[PDB]
Coordinates of C-alpha atoms in Angstrom, one line a residue:
Chain A
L1 CA 14.5 -49.6 142.6
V2 CA 15.3 -53.1 143.8
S3 CA 12.9 -56.1 143.7
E4 CA 12.6 -58.5 146.6
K5 CA 14.2 -61.4 144.7
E6 CA 17.1 -59.2 143.8
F7 CA 17.5 -58.1 147.4
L8 CA 17.4 -61.8 148.4
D9 CA 20.1 -62.6 145.9
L10 CA 22.4 -59.7 146.9
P11 CA 25.8 -60.5 148.4
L12 CA 25.8 -59.8 152.2
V13 CA 28.1 -56.7 151.8
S14 CA 25.6 -55.1 149.4
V15 CA 22.8 -55.6 151.9
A16 CA 24.9 -54.1 154.6
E17 CA 25.7 -51.0 152.5
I18 CA 22.0 -50.6 151.7
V19 CA 21.1 -50.9 155.4
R20 CA 23.8 -48.3 156.4
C21 CA 22.4 -46.1 153.7
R22 CA 18.7 -46.4 154.4
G23 CA 18.4 -48.0 157.8
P24 CA 17.3 -49.6 160.1
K25 CA 20.0 -47.9 162.0
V26 CA 18.4 -48.7 165.4
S27 CA 16.6 -52.1 165.8
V28 CA 14.8 -53.4 168.8
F29 CA 14.9 -57.2 169.2
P30 CA 13.9 -58.8 172.4
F31 CA 14.6 -62.5 172.4
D32 CA 11.1 -63.9 173.1
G33 CA 9.6 -67.4 173.2
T34 CA 12.9 -68.8 174.4
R35 CA 10.9 -71.2 176.6
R36 CA 9.0 -72.9 173.8
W37 CA 12.0 -73.0 171.5
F38 CA 14.1 -74.6 174.3
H39 CA 11.5 -77.4 174.7
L40 CA 11.1 -77.8 170.9
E41 CA 14.7 -77.6 169.5
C42 CA 16.9 -78.7 172.5
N43 CA 16.8 -81.6 175.0
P44 CA 15.4 -80.2 178.3
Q45 CA 16.5 -83.4 180.0
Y46 CA 20.1 -83.0 179.1
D47 CA 20.8 -79.4 177.8
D48 CA 21.0 -76.4 180.0
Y49 CA 18.6 -73.4 179.3
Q50 CA 21.0 -70.5 179.9
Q51 CA 23.9 -71.6 177.7
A52 CA 21.8 -72.7 174.7
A53 CA 19.7 -69.5 174.9
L54 CA 22.9 -67.3 175.1
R55 CA 24.3 -69.1 172.1
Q56 CA 21.2 -68.3 170.1
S57 CA 21.1 -64.6 171.2
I58 CA 24.8 -64.4 170.1
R59 CA 23.9 -65.9 166.7
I60 CA 21.1 -63.4 166.1
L61 CA 23.0 -60.3 167.3
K62 CA 25.9 -61.3 165.1
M63 CA 23.5 -61.6 162.2
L64 CA 21.9 -58.2 162.8
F65 CA 25.3 -56.4 163.2
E66 CA 26.6 -58.1 160.1
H67 CA 23.7 -56.7 158.1
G68 CA 24.9 -53.2 158.7
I69 CA 22.6 -52.3 161.6
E70 CA 24.5 -50.0 164.0
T71 CA 22.5 -50.3 167.2
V72 CA 20.5 -53.2 168.7
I73 CA 18.3 -52.6 171.6
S74 CA 17.4 -55.9 173.4
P75 CA 15.1 -56.0 176.4
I76 CA 16.1 -59.1 178.4
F77 CA 14.1 -59.1 181.7
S78 CA 11.3 -57.0 183.1
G79 CA 8.8 -68.8 191.2
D80 CA 10.7 -66.5 193.7
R81 CA 14.2 -66.8 195.1
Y82 CA 15.0 -68.6 191.9
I83 CA 16.3 -65.0 191.6
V84 CA 19.8 -66.3 192.2
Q85 CA 19.6 -68.4 189.1
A86 CA 18.2 -65.4 187.0
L87 CA 20.9 -63.1 188.4
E88 CA 23.4 -65.7 187.1
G89 CA 21.6 -65.6 183.8
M90 CA 22.1 -61.8 183.7
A91 CA 25.7 -62.3 184.8
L92 CA 26.4 -64.3 181.7
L93 CA 25.9 -61.2 179.6
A94 CA 29.0 -59.7 181.3
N95 CA 31.1 -62.7 182.2
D96 CA 30.5 -65.5 179.7
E97 CA 33.7 -66.0 177.6
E98 CA 31.9 -66.6 174.3
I99 CA 29.9 -63.4 174.5
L100 CA 32.9 -61.4 175.6
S101 CA 34.7 -62.7 172.5
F102 CA 31.7 -61.7 170.5
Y103 CA 31.8 -58.1 171.8
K104 CA 35.5 -58.0 171.0
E105 CA 35.3 -59.6 167.5
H106 CA 32.4 -57.4 166.4
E107 CA 33.5 -54.2 168.2
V108 CA 30.3 -53.8 170.2
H109 CA 30.0 -51.3 173.0
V110 CA 27.6 -52.7 175.5
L111 CA 25.2 -50.5 177.5
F112 CA 22.5 -51.3 180.0
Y113 CA 19.3 -49.3 180.6
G114 CA 16.4 -49.5 183.0
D115 CA 15.6 -49.5 186.7
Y116 CA 17.9 -52.4 187.6
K117 CA 20.0 -50.5 190.2
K118 CA 16.9 -50.1 192.3
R119 CA 14.9 -53.2 191.3
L120 CA 17.7 -55.8 191.6
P121 CA 18.0 -57.3 195.1
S122 CA 20.2 -55.5 197.7
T123 CA 22.3 -58.7 198.0
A124 CA 26.0 -59.1 197.3
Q125 CA 25.0 -61.0 194.2
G126 CA 22.7 -58.2 193.0
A127 CA 25.4 -55.6 193.6
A128 CA 27.8 -57.9 191.8
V129 CA 25.6 -58.1 188.7
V130 CA 25.2 -54.3 188.7
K131 CA 28.9 -53.8 189.1
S132 CA 29.7 -56.2 186.3
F133 CA 27.2 -54.3 184.0
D134 CA 29.1 -51.0 184.9
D135 CA 32.5 -52.7 184.2
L136 CA 31.3 -54.2 180.9
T137 CA 30.2 -50.8 179.7
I138 CA 33.6 -49.4 180.6
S139 CA 35.7 -52.3 179.1
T140 CA 33.8 -52.2 175.8
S141 CA 33.9 -48.4 175.6
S142 CA 36.8 -48.4 173.1
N143 CA 34.5 -50.3 170.7
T144 CA 32.7 -48.0 168.2
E145 CA 31.4 -50.1 165.3
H146 CA 28.2 -51.3 167.0
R147 CA 26.1 -50.5 170.0
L148 CA 24.2 -53.0 172.1
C149 CA 21.7 -51.8 174.7
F150 CA 20.4 -54.5 177.1
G151 CA 17.2 -53.6 178.9
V152 CA 16.9 -54.8 182.6
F153 CA 13.6 -53.4 184.1
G154 CA 13.6 -51.0 181.1
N155 CA 9.9 -50.4 181.0
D156 CA 8.7 -47.3 182.9
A157 CA 11.2 -44.5 182.3
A158 CA 8.9 -41.7 183.5
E159 CA 10.2 -41.4 187.1
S160 CA 13.8 -41.8 186.0
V161 CA 13.4 -39.0 183.5
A162 CA 11.7 -36.9 186.2
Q163 CA 14.7 -37.3 188.6
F164 CA 17.3 -36.9 185.9
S165 CA 15.6 -33.7 184.7
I166 CA 15.4 -32.2 188.2
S167 CA 19.1 -32.8 188.8
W168 CA 20.0 -31.6 185.4
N169 CA 18.1 -28.4 185.8
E170 CA 19.7 -27.9 189.2
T171 CA 23.2 -28.2 187.9
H172 CA 22.8 -26.5 184.4
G173 CA 20.1 -23.9 185.0
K174 CA 17.7 -25.1 182.3
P175 CA 15.9 -28.4 181.5
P176 CA 17.7 -31.1 179.6
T177 CA 16.9 -31.3 175.9
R178 CA 15.4 -34.5 174.5
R179 CA 18.9 -35.6 173.3
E180 CA 20.3 -35.0 176.8
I181 CA 17.4 -37.0 178.4
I182 CA 18.1 -39.9 176.0
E183 CA 21.8 -39.8 176.8
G184 CA 21.0 -39.9 180.5
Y185 CA 18.7 -42.9 180.2
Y186 CA 20.6 -45.1 177.7
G187 CA 24.1 -43.8 178.6
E188 CA 24.7 -42.4 175.2
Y189 CA 22.5 -40.7 172.6
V190 CA 20.6 -43.1 170.5
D191 CA 18.2 -42.4 167.6
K192 CA 14.6 -43.5 167.6
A193 CA 14.0 -47.2 166.8
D194 CA 13.6 -47.9 163.1
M195 CA 12.1 -51.3 163.7
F196 CA 10.9 -53.7 166.3
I197 CA 11.0 -57.4 165.7
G198 CA 8.6 -59.2 168.1
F199 CA 7.1 -62.7 168.4
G200 CA 3.6 -64.3 168.8
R201 CA 1.0 -62.0 170.3
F202 CA 1.3 -58.5 168.7
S203 CA 2.9 -56.3 171.4
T204 CA 6.0 -54.2 171.9
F205 CA 7.8 -53.2 175.1
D206 CA 10.9 -51.9 176.8
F207 CA 12.4 -49.3 174.6
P208 CA 11.3 -46.1 176.4
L209 CA 11.8 -42.8 174.5
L210 CA 12.8 -44.4 171.3
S211 CA 9.4 -45.4 169.9
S212 CA 7.8 -43.5 167.0
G213 CA 5.1 -43.8 164.4
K214 CA 8.1 -44.5 162.0
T215 CA 9.1 -47.6 163.9
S216 CA 8.3 -50.5 161.7
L217 CA 6.7 -53.4 163.6
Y218 CA 7.1 -57.1 162.7
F219 CA 6.0 -60.3 164.6
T220 CA 7.5 -63.7 163.9
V221 CA 5.3 -66.7 164.2
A222 CA 8.1 -69.0 165.6
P223 CA 10.2 -67.9 168.6
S224 CA 12.9 -65.4 167.8
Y225 CA 15.7 -68.1 167.8
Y226 CA 14.3 -69.6 164.7
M227 CA 15.2 -66.4 162.9
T228 CA 16.8 -67.3 159.5
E229 CA 18.8 -65.1 157.1
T230 CA 16.0 -65.2 154.5
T231 CA 13.5 -63.9 157.1
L232 CA 15.8 -61.1 158.2
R233 CA 16.2 -60.1 154.6
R234 CA 12.4 -60.1 153.9
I235 CA 12.0 -57.9 157.0
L236 CA 14.8 -55.5 155.8
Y237 CA 13.4 -55.4 152.3
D238 CA 9.9 -54.5 153.7
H239 CA 11.2 -51.7 155.9
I240 CA 13.6 -50.2 153.4
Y241 CA 11.6 -50.3 150.1
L242 CA 8.0 -50.9 151.0
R243 CA 7.2 -49.2 154.2
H244 CA 7.9 -45.7 152.8
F245 CA 7.3 -46.4 149.1
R246 CA 7.3 -43.4 146.9
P247 CA 5.4 -41.9 145.3
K248 CA 2.4 -42.2 147.6
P249 CA -0.9 -43.5 146.2
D250 CA -2.8 -41.0 143.9
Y251 CA -6.4 -42.1 144.2
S252 CA -7.6 -39.4 141.7
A253 CA -5.4 -40.9 138.9
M254 CA -6.8 -44.4 139.5
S255 CA -9.2 -46.0 137.1
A256 CA -12.8 -46.6 138.1
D257 CA -12.1 -50.3 138.2
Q258 CA -9.1 -50.1 140.5
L259 CA -11.2 -48.0 142.9
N260 CA -13.8 -50.6 142.6
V261 CA -11.4 -53.4 143.6
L262 CA -10.3 -51.3 146.7
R263 CA -13.9 -50.4 147.6
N264 CA -15.1 -54.0 147.3
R265 CA -12.2 -55.5 149.3
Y266 CA -12.7 -53.0 152.1
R267 CA -16.4 -53.4 152.1
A268 CA -16.5 -57.3 152.3
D269 CA -13.4 -57.5 158.6
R270 CA -9.7 -58.6 158.1
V271 CA -7.6 -57.5 161.1
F272 CA -4.1 -58.7 161.8
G273 CA -3.5 -59.5 165.5
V274 CA -6.8 -61.3 165.9
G275 CA -5.7 -64.8 166.8
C276 CA -6.8 -68.3 167.8
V277 CA -5.8 -70.5 170.7
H278 CA -4.7 -74.2 170.4
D279 CA -3.5 -76.2 173.3
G280 CA -3.2 -73.0 175.3
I281 CA -1.1 -71.3 172.7
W282 CA -2.1 -68.2 170.8
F283 CA -1.4 -67.9 167.0
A284 CA -2.1 -64.9 164.8
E285 CA -4.6 -65.7 162.1
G286 CA -4.0 -65.1 158.4
Chain B
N1 CA -15.8 -67.1 181.2
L2 CA -15.9 -70.2 179.0
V3 CA -17.2 -68.3 176.0
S4 CA -16.6 -69.0 172.3
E5 CA -16.3 -66.5 169.5
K6 CA -19.7 -67.4 168.0
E7 CA -21.3 -67.0 171.5
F8 CA -19.6 -63.7 172.0
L9 CA -20.8 -62.5 168.6
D10 CA -24.3 -63.5 169.4
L11 CA -24.5 -61.7 172.8
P12 CA -26.7 -58.7 173.3
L13 CA -24.8 -55.4 173.3
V14 CA -25.4 -54.8 177.0
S15 CA -23.9 -58.2 177.8
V16 CA -20.8 -57.3 175.8
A17 CA -20.5 -53.8 177.3
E18 CA -20.8 -55.4 180.8
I19 CA -18.0 -57.9 180.0
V20 CA -15.8 -55.1 178.6
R21 CA -16.5 -53.1 181.8
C22 CA -15.5 -56.2 183.9
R23 CA -12.4 -57.4 181.9
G24 CA -11.3 -54.6 179.6
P25 CA -10.1 -53.1 177.4
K26 CA -10.6 -50.1 179.8
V27 CA -8.2 -47.8 177.9
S28 CA -8.2 -48.2 174.1
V29 CA -6.1 -46.2 171.6
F30 CA -7.7 -45.6 168.2
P31 CA -6.3 -43.3 165.6
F32 CA -8.5 -42.6 162.6
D33 CA -6.2 -43.5 159.8
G34 CA -6.4 -44.1 156.0
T35 CA -8.9 -41.3 155.8
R36 CA -7.8 -39.9 152.4
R37 CA -8.3 -43.3 150.9
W38 CA -11.6 -43.9 152.6
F39 CA -12.8 -40.5 151.4
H40 CA -11.8 -41.2 147.8
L41 CA -13.6 -44.6 148.0
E42 CA -16.8 -43.9 149.9
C43 CA -17.6 -40.3 149.1
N44 CA -17.8 -38.2 146.0
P45 CA -14.6 -36.1 146.1
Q46 CA -16.2 -33.9 143.5
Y47 CA -19.4 -33.2 145.5
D48 CA -18.8 -34.2 149.2
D49 CA -16.9 -32.2 151.8
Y50 CA -13.9 -33.9 153.4
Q51 CA -14.1 -32.6 157.0
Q52 CA -17.8 -33.2 157.6
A53 CA -17.6 -36.7 156.2
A54 CA -14.5 -37.5 158.3
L55 CA -16.0 -36.0 161.5
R56 CA -19.2 -37.9 161.0
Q57 CA -17.3 -41.2 160.8
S58 CA -15.1 -40.4 163.8
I59 CA -18.2 -39.7 165.8
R60 CA -19.8 -42.9 164.6
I61 CA -16.8 -44.9 165.7
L62 CA -16.2 -43.2 169.1
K63 CA -19.9 -43.8 169.7
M64 CA -19.5 -47.5 168.9
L65 CA -16.4 -47.9 171.2
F66 CA -18.1 -46.2 174.1
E67 CA -21.3 -48.2 173.6
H68 CA -19.2 -51.3 173.9
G69 CA -18.3 -50.4 177.5
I70 CA -14.8 -49.0 176.9
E71 CA -14.1 -46.3 179.6
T72 CA -11.3 -44.3 177.9
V73 CA -10.6 -43.9 174.2
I74 CA -7.3 -42.2 173.3
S75 CA -7.3 -40.8 169.8
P76 CA -4.2 -39.2 168.2
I77 CA -5.6 -36.6 165.8
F78 CA -2.6 -34.8 164.6
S79 CA 0.8 -36.4 164.7
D80 CA 4.2 -34.9 164.0
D81 CA 6.1 -38.2 164.3
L82 CA 4.1 -39.5 161.3
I83 CA -0.4 -26.6 161.1
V84 CA 0.3 -28.0 157.6
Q85 CA -3.5 -27.8 157.5
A86 CA -5.4 -28.4 160.7
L87 CA -5.2 -26.1 163.6
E88 CA -8.6 -26.1 161.9
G89 CA -9.5 -29.7 162.6
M90 CA -8.9 -29.6 166.3
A91 CA -11.0 -26.4 166.3
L92 CA -13.7 -28.5 164.8
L93 CA -13.3 -31.0 167.6
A94 CA -13.9 -28.3 170.2
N95 CA -16.4 -26.2 168.3
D96 CA -18.6 -28.3 165.9
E97 CA -22.2 -28.4 167.1
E98 CA -22.7 -32.1 166.3
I99 CA -19.7 -33.3 168.1
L100 CA -20.4 -31.1 171.2
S101 CA -23.9 -32.6 171.1
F102 CA -22.2 -36.0 171.1
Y103 CA -20.0 -35.3 174.2
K104 CA -23.2 -34.2 175.9
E105 CA -25.5 -37.1 174.9
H106 CA -22.9 -39.7 175.7
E107 CA -21.6 -38.0 178.8
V108 CA -18.0 -37.8 177.6
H109 CA -15.3 -36.1 179.5
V110 CA -12.9 -34.6 176.9
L111 CA -9.1 -34.1 177.4
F112 CA -6.4 -32.9 175.0
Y113 CA -2.7 -33.9 175.3
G114 CA 0.4 -33.1 173.5
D115 CA 2.8 -30.3 172.6
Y116 CA -0.1 -28.2 171.0
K117 CA 0.5 -25.1 173.1
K118 CA 3.9 -24.7 171.6
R119 CA 3.3 -26.2 168.2
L120 CA 0.2 -24.2 167.4
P121 CA 0.6 -20.9 165.7
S122 CA 1.4 -18.1 168.2
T123 CA -1.5 -16.1 166.7
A124 CA -4.7 -14.9 168.4
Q125 CA -6.3 -17.8 166.5
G126 CA -3.9 -20.3 168.1
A127 CA -4.6 -18.8 171.5
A128 CA -8.3 -19.0 170.9
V129 CA -8.2 -22.6 169.9
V130 CA -6.1 -23.5 173.0
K131 CA -8.6 -21.6 175.1
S132 CA -11.4 -23.6 173.5
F133 CA -9.7 -26.9 174.4
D134 CA -9.4 -25.7 178.0
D135 CA -13.0 -24.5 178.1
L136 CA -14.2 -27.8 176.6
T137 CA -12.3 -29.8 179.2
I138 CA -13.8 -27.7 182.0
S139 CA -17.3 -27.8 180.4
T140 CA -17.4 -31.6 180.1
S141 CA -15.7 -32.2 183.5
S142 CA -19.0 -33.3 185.1
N143 CA -19.4 -36.0 182.5
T144 CA -18.4 -39.3 184.0
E145 CA -19.6 -42.2 181.7
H146 CA -16.6 -42.0 179.3
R147 CA -13.3 -40.3 178.7
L148 CA -11.9 -39.1 175.4
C149 CA -8.3 -38.0 175.0
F150 CA -7.4 -36.2 171.8
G151 CA -3.8 -36.2 170.8
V152 CA -2.5 -33.0 169.3
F153 CA 1.2 -33.4 168.6
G154 CA 1.1 -36.0 171.4
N155 CA 4.4 -37.7 170.6
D156 CA 7.8 -37.3 172.5
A157 CA 6.6 -36.4 175.9
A158 CA 10.1 -36.4 177.3
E159 CA 10.6 -32.7 177.3
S160 CA 7.2 -32.0 178.7
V161 CA 7.9 -34.5 181.5
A162 CA 11.2 -32.9 182.2
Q163 CA 9.6 -29.4 182.5
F164 CA 6.6 -30.6 184.6
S165 CA 9.0 -32.5 186.9
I166 CA 11.2 -29.5 187.3
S167 CA 8.2 -27.2 188.2
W168 CA 6.8 -29.9 190.5
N169 CA 10.0 -30.3 192.4
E170 CA 10.1 -26.5 192.8
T171 CA 6.6 -26.4 194.4
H172 CA 6.7 -29.7 196.4
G173 CA 10.3 -30.3 197.3
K174 CA 10.3 -33.8 195.8
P175 CA 10.0 -35.4 192.3
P176 CA 6.5 -36.2 191.1
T177 CA 5.4 -39.9 191.2
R178 CA 4.6 -41.7 188.0
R179 CA 0.9 -41.1 188.7
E180 CA 1.5 -37.4 189.0
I181 CA 3.5 -37.3 185.9
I182 CA 0.6 -38.9 184.0
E183 CA -1.9 -36.5 185.5
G184 CA 0.5 -33.7 184.4
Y185 CA 0.7 -34.9 180.8
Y186 CA -3.0 -35.9 180.2
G187 CA -4.6 -33.6 182.7
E188 CA -5.9 -36.6 184.7
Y189 CA -4.7 -40.0 185.7
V190 CA -5.1 -42.5 183.0
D191 CA -4.3 -46.2 183.1
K192 CA -2.0 -48.0 180.7
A193 CA -3.5 -48.7 177.3
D194 CA -5.1 -52.2 177.1
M195 CA -5.2 -52.1 173.2
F196 CA -4.2 -50.2 170.2
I197 CA -6.1 -50.6 166.9
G198 CA -4.1 -49.3 163.9
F199 CA -4.5 -49.5 160.1
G200 CA -2.2 -50.8 157.3
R201 CA 1.5 -50.7 158.0
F202 CA 2.2 -52.1 161.5
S203 CA 3.2 -49.2 163.7
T204 CA 1.9 -47.4 166.8
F205 CA 2.2 -43.8 167.9
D206 CA 1.1 -41.0 170.1
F207 CA 0.1 -42.4 173.5
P208 CA 3.1 -41.5 175.6
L209 CA 3.5 -43.0 179.1
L210 CA 0.6 -45.5 178.5
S211 CA 2.2 -48.2 176.4
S212 CA 3.1 -51.6 177.8
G213 CA 3.8 -55.2 176.8
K214 CA 0.3 -55.8 177.9
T215 CA -1.1 -53.4 175.2
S216 CA -2.7 -55.8 172.6
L217 CA -1.9 -54.5 169.1
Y218 CA -4.3 -54.9 166.1
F219 CA -4.0 -53.7 162.5
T220 CA -7.0 -53.5 160.3
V221 CA -6.6 -54.0 156.5
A222 CA -9.3 -51.4 155.7
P223 CA -9.1 -47.7 156.7
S224 CA -10.4 -47.0 160.2
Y225 CA -13.8 -45.7 159.0
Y226 CA -14.7 -49.1 157.6
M227 CA -14.8 -50.4 161.2
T228 CA -18.0 -52.4 161.7
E229 CA -19.7 -53.8 164.8
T230 CA -18.6 -57.4 164.0
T231 CA -14.9 -56.4 163.5
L232 CA -14.9 -54.6 166.8
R233 CA -16.4 -57.6 168.5
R234 CA -13.8 -60.0 167.0
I235 CA -11.0 -57.6 168.3
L236 CA -12.6 -57.5 171.7
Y237 CA -13.0 -61.2 171.9
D238 CA -9.4 -61.8 171.0
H239 CA -8.2 -59.3 173.6
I240 CA -10.5 -60.5 176.5
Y241 CA -10.4 -64.3 176.0
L242 CA -7.4 -65.2 173.8
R243 CA -4.5 -62.8 174.5
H244 CA -4.3 -63.9 178.1
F245 CA -5.6 -67.4 178.1
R246 CA -5.4 -69.3 181.3
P247 CA -3.6 -71.4 182.3
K248 CA -0.4 -70.2 180.5
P249 CA 1.5 -73.0 178.6
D250 CA 3.3 -75.6 180.7
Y251 CA 5.7 -77.3 178.2
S252 CA 7.2 -79.8 180.6
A253 CA 3.6 -81.1 181.1
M254 CA 3.0 -81.4 177.4
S255 CA 2.7 -84.7 175.5
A256 CA 5.1 -85.7 172.7
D257 CA 2.4 -84.8 170.1
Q258 CA 1.6 -81.4 171.7
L259 CA 5.3 -80.6 171.3
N260 CA 5.4 -82.2 167.8
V261 CA 2.6 -80.1 166.3
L262 CA 4.5 -76.9 167.3
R263 CA 8.0 -78.2 166.3
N264 CA 6.6 -79.3 162.9
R265 CA 4.8 -76.1 162.3
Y266 CA 7.9 -74.0 163.0
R267 CA 10.3 -76.2 161.0
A268 CA 8.0 -76.7 158.0
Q269 CA 7.0 -73.0 157.8
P270 CA 10.3 -71.4 159.0
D271 CA 10.0 -67.9 157.6
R272 CA 6.5 -66.8 158.6
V273 CA 6.5 -63.1 159.7
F274 CA 3.6 -60.8 160.2
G275 CA 4.3 -57.2 159.1
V276 CA 6.1 -57.9 155.9
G277 CA 4.0 -56.5 153.1
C278 CA 3.6 -55.9 149.4
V279 CA 3.1 -52.7 147.4
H280 CA 0.7 -52.2 144.5
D281 CA 0.0 -48.9 142.9
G282 CA 1.8 -47.3 145.9
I283 CA -0.4 -49.1 148.4
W284 CA 1.2 -51.2 151.0
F285 CA -0.8 -54.3 152.2
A286 CA 0.3 -56.8 154.9
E287 CA 0.8 -60.4 153.5
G288 CA -0.5 -63.6 155.1

């Protein structure tokens, strides 16, 4: 029984306790539109993309964890032979000092999911990235306050599940349960996503097995890196108090006039996700 | 392909259907949602019958979708991630004269997917309904104009996939490919969903294996049954012409002002988020 203004005025710790009580326990947050943001808020002539971007990802993950969210799932990647570059960008997640300090300071256990072992190049660099992912999962394994799952080619889990399940049944004598399948794919058991925060065109991606009809979807207008505290709070408020508001509507107990308002509104077309294009850029209308 | 929204709206139906056939959405997911509300608003709950009304509207809409050139419609009917009443409803979908007449007239091939075999009552009635699903799939298998996939507890395919894959390896000596996994789950190979049209609260559900980042998501304000021809055309237009506009943005090639309009927009309206709603009399509505 909290209003939005009240929720906005709460001290941070109260918000965190509410989130631990009611969720979202598992939040999906790809960092999207990093391109556009980099051209708008940095200097592309002087600044370097990878470091700036990493700084912002750190800021947002910090914010999410500090709001009492236990697990963040963050799909990162899904010319050519600029692959060296992008393998270095992946490498930052396991070697950059600032982010390692972040994992330490916030007691984050980092896990990687997806088809990266087979899809990454069979080069010494590719092998090095994979090995640094493995090693990072091991060296953060003593952390238990938060879980961060990074998705690298984490889009089509069907074949991976098929093979995991064949092996499992061969060594256990029965199929793996859903929990066991999830543990196999993410490394540890993770609950279904409570929310997905996307950007721009309405679409979701790269959290196999964890999607449900109870996953709340949001789409920012600005690139993810513009995410402010106020915004995160309006999202949290919507998911916690409004998405599953009780009691459910009782149409029979509604006056003739209320029913008239609903009837008239629905009769006189409005659909979220229908957009417009300006200078080659899509914007949601409304 | 240089077509405006007004132009697209003014096109003859066959032109639209041909465009949809050419450019998609080939596979469209469309649950019928907000049906209690729709029924209390557009029918006489005191005189009218719920199921006939609802079925009539579902037929109307599926008809509209197929008439717009969409090959496959996937429609979650009963969802357990979102018995109780309807083992009955699905029975209607495989047994009601009007809808059977619809599958015939519109040459629809019907499939059922989900955990229904295990979730349906283990009674003779449950068995009979399952058999009628099977029989309907066989019966409409010669229909080739359209495909309709009904979701009955079609969430959480993981365990189904595990079991299918175990059996498959037992018979073939190797794991099934993705294609084979999809055939196993849906009965036939189906491509990834090109769009999902939902209602109200932004959420999607019950099309396992077929979701991708390329699935365009839409959320109507009104309950599904209010869907009109114009609304559907606006959705189609957005998906075909706007969602994947070419060329894609080249920021380094953009003028100072092209960057400025964007920067200014984001800085001057910093908290804009679609999916945040408001509640009145227990009804959630998206803001914006």
